[PDB]
Amino acid sequence: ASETFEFQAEITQLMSLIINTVYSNKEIFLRELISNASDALDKIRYKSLSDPKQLETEPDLFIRITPKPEQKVLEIRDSGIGMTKAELINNLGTIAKSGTKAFMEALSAGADVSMIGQFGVGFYSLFLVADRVQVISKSNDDEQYIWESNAGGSFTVTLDEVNERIGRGTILRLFLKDDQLEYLEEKRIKEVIKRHSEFVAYPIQLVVTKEVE
Numbered sequence: 001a002s003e004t005f006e007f008q009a010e011i012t013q014l015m016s017l018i019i020n021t022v023y024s025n026k027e028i029f030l031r032e033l034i035s036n037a038s039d040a041l042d043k044i045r046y047k048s049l050s051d052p053k054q055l056e057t058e059p060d061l062f063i064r065i066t067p068k069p070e071q072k073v074l075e076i077r078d079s080g081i082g083m084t085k086a087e088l089i090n091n092l093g094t095i096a097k098s099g100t101k102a103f104m105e106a107l108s109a110g111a112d113v114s115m116i117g118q119f120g121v122g123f124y125s126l127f128l129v130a131d132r133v134q135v136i137s138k139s140n141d142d143e144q145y146i147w148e149s150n151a152g153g154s155f156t157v158t159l160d161e162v163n164e165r166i167g168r169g170t171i172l173r174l175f176l177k178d179d180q181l182e183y184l185e186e187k188r189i190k191e192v193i194k195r196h197s198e199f200v201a202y203p204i205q206l207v208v209t210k211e212v213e
């Protein structure tokens, strides 16, 4: 069964601002998701310094981006620390975030949307280009779970019996809007990566599908 949770009020406001923003430079969403992926990789690697066994569920540390054109989906995967069920629930919606209201105020005063990561709330930049999102996550401390939001006032958390096992880490599965399908293109993804994520400690893999000729 799927469990349903209410978003904290300000987080619902933020999603609503972001999903209904005409604004330019939407490409910044990729920088933010790569940064989070990199943060999740830092954590597992730092944890592993004193607990090497933690790496064993997925010994390769990578960031991997997979266009799925038929579904109009873009997936960004990392083999970082992952999140437990309680973490998905608490950290992705139910609990007020320090920077939510401050960012919205900054935006309202003229701040660049790309400042979002500096307010600690950059995950929500995915709504720039997606109308729906699944966060699929496996922490060493829990089962694999699916968190899901359509920017509306509630999200669901479901035990994952439908997706590939990840050994450890997270997949952000972005259901792209019809006007943002450009982010399925290899050439476009490489440009955005090379522009705004030059200094990343982990390999960034692009999964490309090609008809044999």
Ligand SMILES: CO[C@H]1[C@@H](OC)C[C@H](C)[C@@H](OC)C2=CC(=O)C=C(NC(=O)/C(C)=C/C=C\[C@H](C)[C@@H](OC(N)=O)/C(C)=C/[C@@H]1C)C2=O
Binding pocket: 035, 036, 037, 039, 040, 043, 078, 080, 081, 082, 083, 087, 091, 092, 120, 121, 122, 123, 124, 135, 170
């Ligand atoms: C143990 O740290 C967790 C996370 O706690 C559950 C840490 C915090 C949410 C916070 O630490 C200060 C943030 C750490 C970050 O690096 C980025 C953030 N910005 C966000 O917009 C949010 C809400 C990200 C949340 C989950 C995200 C999909 C994550 O992205 C992944 N896992 O790829 C994420 C950064 C999860 C990390 C690994 C944080 O809050």
